[PDB]
Amino acid sequence: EGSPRLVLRALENMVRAAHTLAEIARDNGNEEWLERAARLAEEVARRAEELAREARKEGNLELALKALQILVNAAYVLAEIARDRGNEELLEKAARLAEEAARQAEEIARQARKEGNFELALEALEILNEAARVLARIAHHRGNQELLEKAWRLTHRSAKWSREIAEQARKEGE
Amino acid sequence: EGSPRLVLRALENMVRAAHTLAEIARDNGNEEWLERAARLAEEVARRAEELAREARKEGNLELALKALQILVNAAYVLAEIARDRGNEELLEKAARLAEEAARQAEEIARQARKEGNFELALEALEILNEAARVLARIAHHRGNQELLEKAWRLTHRSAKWSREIAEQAR
Amino acid sequence: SPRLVLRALENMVRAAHTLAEIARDNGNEEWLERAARLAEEVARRAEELAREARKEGNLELALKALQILVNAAYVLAEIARDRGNEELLEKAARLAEEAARQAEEIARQARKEGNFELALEALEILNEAARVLARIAHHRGNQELLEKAWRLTHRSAKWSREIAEQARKEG
């Protein structure tokens, strides 16, 4: 018996370090230190994909969303490491990681809106913002109009489906 | 009845969306997208101001202050868009929204300070920082020194009254 | 009420941060010194609240007092870089170095005591402190302190991974 919330909170610390490591390597022109930072971010993305995968099978979608957030943040670290280093092969893998998190975050948001689970939807709609903000930035440094439009549309679904809940949770006769 | 907790988190997602749209439009130079981003941010400014008014008429000051920061967040997005499009009519509209948030935030701090409710007072003084951060950025992007002194005076008020409450609890 | 004293201190760092932004973006030298004295003030205040709460056994309060210390150390460091003041970079280095120790010490105690939540809460402040020390070492030309902040960040990642394996389900 363990605590998946603690595995979450630990993975939160590892991207913050991977982001800090990439920052230190970048500001000081250390190509070997970029590689050690990129290797750390590659673990978390693989670690975040497993936890989100497992949490989906047991039906706790709140963990799934929080795991997809860490997947998004790791995709942002790997993205800017690939850019400051001319590696377009990582930017593809980084974009497809953020896009998969954006795809799954919409699934949970779409189904939570269908059930009336207002809290799951808003939490999932928060993660769509995080994934869509990263998809747009990554697609900008890659010249992909379609995923840039995808990031634009996803943000509007975050705004519209949240607006529904806001009007749908208004006072009785306001 | 209704759920103000749901209305808040829904409003919070809506500002985050408007902030993202403004960034996506800005980084890609799509002026038509900037209009859509500003239209949504001005929308949330209504909702936040409306709920803040309703929440205070009930005396629910925590909900009110949480609504006032949504104003500051919505007002800050509008200010950044007016910075790009050269739109002077929105800089005026954006500053008046932050001035209104700093207005109500200080009044709730004064009443809570006079009632001994120091937790609420410190939460209200946080929003003066939020509002004055926007007015300072606006005053810089329009060269207005009178508004800098406002933002500086309001930021300085947040620290002065917070230290007073801190030593009251020593 | 130390939770109230803490909450007020988190407000002044936000204030000290904003005043420095107003001063830097508008080049007002009298305002920058004004912001620095507020930043160093909270760092000294937060330093006292941390040891008060730690000698009392309230480690959650001590860590949140340590983040305020890190944030104030960041405010002073950003001011010193934009103003080329080497004596202020030294003060910012002390404050982040102090926070880096206590974050690592509390992490060791809570980890040996099995409190994995505090351990991760203390390890996150290591990132906060090491990230500040890294920028200081860059704008100050010190390779050893840079190398120090680089081990400190790895320790945040390495010790978190172990707790990540200590907390997984047995399947």
Q: What is the DSSP string of chain B?
A: ---HHHHHHHHHHHHHHHHHHHHHHHHHT-HHHHHHHHHHHHHHHHHHHHHHHHHHHTT-HHHHHHHHHHHHHHHHHHHHHHHHTT-HHHHHHHHHHHHHHHHHHHHHHHHHHHTT-HHHHHHHHHHHHHHHHHHHHHHHTTT-HHHHHHHHHHHHHHHHHHHHHHHHT-
Packed helices C2-25 and C59-83: angle between N→C axes, nearest 10 degrees? 10
How far is residue B105's CA from residue C84's CA, in Å, rounded to a whole number? 37
When computed from its CA atoms, the radius of gyration of chain B, rounded to whole angstroms, is: 17
CB burial of residue B26 (10 Å; 0-12, 13-18, 19+): middle
Q: How far is CA A163 from CA A9, A116, B14, in A?
A: 30, 14, 7
Nearest to A99 by CA among A64, A141, A136: A136
What is the longest distance spanned by two Cα atoms in chain B?
A: 55
How far is residue A67's CA from residue A3's CA, in Å, rounded to a whole number? 14
Amino acid at A116: G
How far is residue B1's CA from residue A81's CA, in Å, rounded to a whole number? 50
Helices (H), C1-115: 2-25, 29-55, 59-83, 86-112
Q: How far is CA C63 from CA A59, A119, A126, B165, C4, in A?
A: 34, 30, 28, 21, 15
Whether A40 and chain C come into contact, CB under 8 Å, resolves to yes
Answer for the pair A79, A138: CB distance below 8 angstroms, yes or no. Answer: yes
Task: Find how far residue B49's CA is from the centre of its chain.
Answer: 10
Inter-chain CB proximity B20 and A136 less than 8 Å: yes
Of A10, A17, A40, the CB nearest to C164: A10
Instruction: Search chain C and give the residue with CA nearest B165.
Output: C8
Instruction: Search chain C and give the residue with CA nearest B151.
Output: C22
Sign of CA dihedral B167, B170, C2, C3: negative
How far is residue B51's CA from residue B12's CA, in Å, rounded to a whole number? 13
Q: In chain B, what residues touch C48 (CB-CB under 8 Å)?
A: none
Amino acid at A89: E
What is the longest distance spanned by two Cα atoms in chain C?
A: 62
- List the structure tokens of A26: 């970048």
Inter-chain CB proximity C156 and A2 less than 8 Å: no
Answer for the pair B118, B112: CB distance below 8 angstroms, yes or no. Answer: yes
Sign of CA dihedral C91, C94, C98, C100: positive
Q: What is the DSSP letter of C27?
A: T
Q: What is the DSSP letter of C67?
A: H
Of B14, B28, B33, the CB nearest to A159: B14
A75-78's contacts with Cβ under 8 Å and 24+ in sequence apart are A75/A45, A75/A101, A75/A134, A75/A138, A76/A19, A76/A134, A76/A137, A76/A138, A77/A15, A77/A18, A77/A19, A77/A22, A77/A37, A77/A38, A77/A41, A78/A38, A78/A41, A78/A42, A78/A45
Q: What is the DSSP letter of C168?
A: S
Nearest to A44 by CA among A114, A101, A87: A101
Nearest to A79 by CA among A142, A124, A130, A126: A142
- List the structure tokens of A80: 């800017």
Packed helices B118-140 and C2-25: angle between N→C axes, nearest 10 degrees? 10
Instruction: Search chain B and give the residue with CA nearest C1.
Output: B169
Residue A10, C-beta contacts closer than 8 angstroms, at least 6 positions apart: C120, C160, C161, C163, C164, C167
Whether B46 and chain A come into contact, CB under 8 Å, resolves to no
Packed helices B118-140 and B61-84: angle between N→C axes, nearest 10 degrees? 10
CB atoms within 10 A of CB A14: 25
> Resolution of the deposited coordinates, in angstroms?
3.0
**Min CA distance, B147 vs chain C (Å)?**
11
């003041």: which residue's tokens? C85
- List the structure tokens of A167: 């009007």
Q: In chain C, what residues touch B122 (CB-CB under 8 Å)?
A: 4, 7-8, 11
Inter-chain CB proximity C153 and A40 less than 8 Å: no
Q: In chain B, what residues touch A119 (CB-CB under 8 Å)?
A: 6
How far is residue A69's CA from residue A55's CA, in Å, rounded to a whole number? 14
- List the structure tokens of B68: 């006032």
Nearest to B106 by CA among B94, B120, B93, B95: B120
Q: In chain B, what residues touch C25 (CB-CB under 8 Å)?
A: 136-137, 140
How far is residue A115's CA from residue A60's CA, in Å, rounded to a whole number? 15
Q: In chain B, what residues touch C4 (CB-CB under 8 Å)?
A: 118-119, 122, 165-166, 169
Whether C21 and chain B come into contact, CB under 8 Å, resolves to yes
Query: DSSP secondary structure string, A81-112?
Result: HHHTTT-HHHHHHHHHHHHHHHHHHHHHHHHH
How far is residue A122's CA from residue B9's CA, in Å, rounded to a whole number? 7
